[PDB]
Amino acid sequence: PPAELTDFKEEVVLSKQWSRSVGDGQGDLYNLLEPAVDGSTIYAASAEGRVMAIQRETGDVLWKKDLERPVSGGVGVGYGLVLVGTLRGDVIALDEATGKKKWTKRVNSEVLSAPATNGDVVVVQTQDDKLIGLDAASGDQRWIYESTVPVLTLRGTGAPLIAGNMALAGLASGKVVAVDVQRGLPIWEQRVAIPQGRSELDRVVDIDGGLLLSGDTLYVVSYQGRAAALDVNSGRLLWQREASSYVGVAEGFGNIYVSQASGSVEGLDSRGASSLWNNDALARRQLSAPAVFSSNVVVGDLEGYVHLLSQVDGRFVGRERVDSDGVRVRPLVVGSWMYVFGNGGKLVAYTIRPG
């Protein structure tokens, strides 16, 4: 039973600029569809197959597309495409400016995360730990990286990231890899997660490394029950923490901030050595990954609240109910704006009052 909400002295108040419903949001997915921004537009998909492009400051709908099929991985955007994956293993590319379908490629396995693109190749990470590179123009397969090698009881829900000429991925098997984005050949591989054993051969578990790319640092914080940061160019371990682990991580003010779904949020130093503060009060509230919005750390919970915590102290300074079906997706902060995507599909844009 989630911990009851606690009283606090309100110091930070959100101003709701616009809200738009996109389909059924996450529907019955166990994984998450994440909206993404490119320039002045925010793009969002829903489990029912509805995809939208919205002017991110006004809320004006630029285009909608009803794909009429089970979208399970999404939004990828860039270089003129919006990209989603389906539970049937389809990767569908839509024109970023009009929403017109450009192509569809049926891939080997379910796609449970947003494809990435550099405008030449679309990189798709599958439930069964393959990275597939597709031609951005046609969808035709360019390369495949399959060290998978199993396993039927894990689902990888990590999204691939393009750094330079590298595609990075945290695989369900617990290994982070960097491959050549043009050829699909490995550049480095680094085991971060604790090795699997058996005795979870009778259960299906979803695995995500919780990747966050910031410059030369790739944070990998969501493998149980460890957390690490890697050099993006070599895979070298910069630091690690045992006895974790975290729903996700965010940077701000020279520190990092983590949440643990089970209901703590914590600030740590740059190198995750020492703890700056810890707020336990959201005990069983099933937190999203954290975002830093101005001087606040923010997390969504199962009841649909976003909580704002002081970056200095961890104390509650703000709270806003967004979508009562819950907020599981990391709030998306772009400068002075924050976009929260509720489980029922409410996409809401906030600024901090009086701005």
Author numbering: 28 to 382
Question: What does the publication say?
Answer:
A multiprotein complex in the outer membrane called β-Barrel Assembly Machine (BAM) then mediates OMP folding and insertion. In E. coli, the BAM complex is composed of BamA, a β-barrel OMP itself previously known as Omp85/YaeT, and the lipoproteins BamB, C, D and E (previously YfgL, NlpB, YfiO and SmpA respectively). BamB is a membrane-associated lipoprotein with lipids attached to the N-terminal cysteine in the mature protein predicted to anchor it to the membrane. Taken together, the structural analysis and mutagenic testing of BamB suggests that its main function is to bind and modulate BamA, rather than directly interact with nascent OMPs.
We report the crystal structure of Pseudomonas aeruginosa BamB refined to 1.85Å resolution. A lipid-free, soluble form of mature Pseudomonas aeruginosa BamB (paBamA, amino acids 19–380) was expressed in E. coli, purified to homogeneity and crystallized as described in Methods. The crystals belong to trigonal space group P3221 and contain a single paBamB molecule per asymmetric unit. The model was then refined against a native dataset to 1.85Å resolution. The final model contains amino acids 28 to 380 (plus two extra amino acids, PG, at the C-terminus resulting from the cloning procedure) with excellent refinement statistics as shown in Table 1. BamB adopts an eight-bladed β-propeller fold. Four antiparallel β-strands named A–D constitute each blade with the A strand being closest to the pseudo-symmetry axis (A1 thus refers to the A strand of Blade1). The eighth blade is formed by three strands from the C-terminus and the D-strand from the N-terminus (blue in Figure 1) mediating closure of the ring. Despite these irregularities in the inner strands, the propeller displays a central pore that is about 20Å wide at the “top” and narrows to about 8Å at the center. The structures of paBamB and ecBamB (E. coli BamB) superimpose with an RMS deviation of 1.8 Å for 286 matching Cα atoms highlighting a high degree of structural conservation despite a relatively modest 30% sequence identity.
